[PDB]
Design a protein around this ligand. Structure first.
Ligand SMILES: [Cl-]
Ligand SMILES: [Cl-]
Ligand SMILES: [Cl-]
Ligand SMILES: [Cl-]
Ligand SMILES: [Cl-]
Lengths: 332, 328
């Protein structure tokens, strides 16, 4: 009938592909200009400033910068500025600040101090007129549009895409630029996956372990965050290289395990651990054809190692929304 | 009949004294190298509890020396074998055994790529030592318990000694020098009221702000490892904004506050949470709603967290032994 029965979370997941398209179209110029400044200034290291889901974006971008450009990336605790007002040596540094609204006093303070202390500050934000924009040398509008879902899926995806576009223009990497260019298609496909077998597993045992290795650890961390946020159920993210050596036995917990595998150098080791876990009797799923014991999760590859995780997180978001809506949990 | 964990905690003060006695020359040598090298940044390489030590040392280096500190994901070397730009950097690797192939690989590659690699380890003959330019033996000695309490304290102390000598910081050196006395005092505290709260509602939330977040993180880890009960560590500036309501969970909250600029904001958030009905304890006499936890100050802001974590280890050991939990 006339009453619509689509959650805000789902509405925003179905807007992710076009949001990325708007960022690719409308943000291309600003991104190219900042990349030109970076090639000229030629900084020798990167500092990131962020909190919450924005910090998972920063983790993603830290792997991307290190793998593409070889630049070491330091995550700066905002208290260094906001509590201690320490003087840092940031000449020759890019400071990358990531924040949906750009209002957080701590993020603004750290970004302001970074500039004072020599860094070229670039903000990735959904509000170009925010306080953060005002303390940065450059602002890249992520073109996420208004978020009404607490999942804030558009903000995560577009933040990461904005940072990847910058890195790709800075590195002058045509393979990555091509993959980025095709993301709306890839993400559209990814949003049509909702992993019914995982939803049944979680319904049976309602907590979740996520795994990542290398770059995909950033989306594994994001996935655990948003699962807690939207479903009010417990989740924990681990490196697949550390999961078998932590405080608690993952297998003894009896909860489903989801391995985030991108088509990169970490795909094989992730698959290997996923299978080892499944061989102990645990319920394990992984986003790769390489697993022989763990269950293969439907996924869409992107054309490049660094864009692959964005496709996986879109599929995850879609799984979580379906899980919640069919159980009468409106995330919002 | 004391537990191995209690015996381990009791050994902490002497272990720190041996580090001061037998590690001072090695630390002074490396500090002299660094002081003249004047690296523009620091990278850290660690996993598990050693990564909490790295967090602690990251804050210490930023606040003392103004150098930004980058935590390097070991897969960058072990999986991707990426070429990094680490010219002139200090790369600090922290590992009890120094055997982890990922830690060894990231450190080896850090050196390959220009960093001066310094290992803080309990085994000077380990593979990690073998790929480092300098090795500082932490003098932790054998781990007696899964809590691995000496390893954490001595690793941090070794890092702090290095930073204090590099910075030529008399006040920090003084505090470090008195650590065995401070930590002996700290080990005699076991927070009985906290144990009652945790017994009643057996999960724990720990908080820190700035430097003390390192020990907050360590605390949650070791509570989980020793007791097999859930714990999670948050920045006090973020705890009221996370995906799950801390007050609504109904579990005790432990605020770690050092005698630094973060003490007041930690105490304020601790009181806000307490004002909402949660059971909150904090290591500061500045809270007026949350309960004050007995604690020993050390003579320097940067050494204060080591006192707090020793008291915490003592509380956990008492909590576990009383309830029939044998961590070991
Ligand atoms: Cl923010
Ligand atoms: Cl990893
Ligand atoms: Cl290790
Ligand atoms: Cl008490
Ligand atoms: Cl903090």
């Amino acid at each position: 009938g006339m009453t619509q029965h689509i959650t805000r979370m789902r509405r925003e997941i179905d807007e992710i592909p076009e949001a990325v398209q708007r960022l690719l179209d409308h943000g291309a110029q600003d991104v190219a200009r900042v990349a030109a400044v970076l090639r000229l200034r030629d900084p020798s290291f990167v500092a990131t400033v962020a909190r919450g889901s924005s910090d998972h974006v920063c983790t993603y971008l830290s792997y991307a910068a290190e793998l593409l450009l070889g630049l070491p990336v330091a995550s700066l605790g905002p208290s260094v500025a906001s509590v201690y007002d320490a003087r840092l040596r940031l000449d020759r540094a890019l400071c990358l600040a990531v924040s949906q609204s750009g209002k957080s006093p701590d993020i603004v303070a750290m970004t302001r101090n970074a500039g004072r202390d020599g860094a070229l500050c670039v903000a990735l934000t959904n509000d170009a007129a925010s306080p953060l924009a005002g303390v940065s040398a450059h602002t890249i509008d992520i073109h996420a549009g208004p978020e009404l879902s607490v999942a804030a899926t558009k903000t995560f995806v577009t933040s990461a895409v904005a940072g990847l576009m910058l890195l790709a223009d800075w590195a002058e990497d045509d393979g990555l630029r091509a993959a980025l260019g095709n993301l709306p298609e890839t993400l559209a496909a990814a949003s049509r996956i909702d992993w019914p077998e995982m939803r049944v597993a979680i319904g049976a045992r309602p907590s979740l372990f996520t795994l990542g290795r290398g770059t995909s650890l950033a989306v594994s961390n994001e996935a655990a965050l948003k699962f807690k946020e939207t479903c009010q159920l417990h989740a924990e993210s681990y490196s697949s290289a550390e999961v078998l050596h932590g405080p608690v036995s993952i297998v003894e917990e009896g909860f489903p395990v989801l391995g985030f595998a991108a088509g990169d150098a970490a795909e094989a080791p992730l698959a290997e651990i996923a299978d080892q876990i499944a061989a102990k009797g645990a319920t394990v799923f992984a986003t790769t054809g390489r697993v022989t014991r763990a269950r293969v999760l439907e996924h869409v590859r992107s054309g490049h190692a660094l864009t692959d995780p964005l496709s996986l997180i879109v599929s995850f978001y879609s799984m979580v929304e379906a899980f919640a809506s069919e159980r009468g949990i409106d995330p919002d």
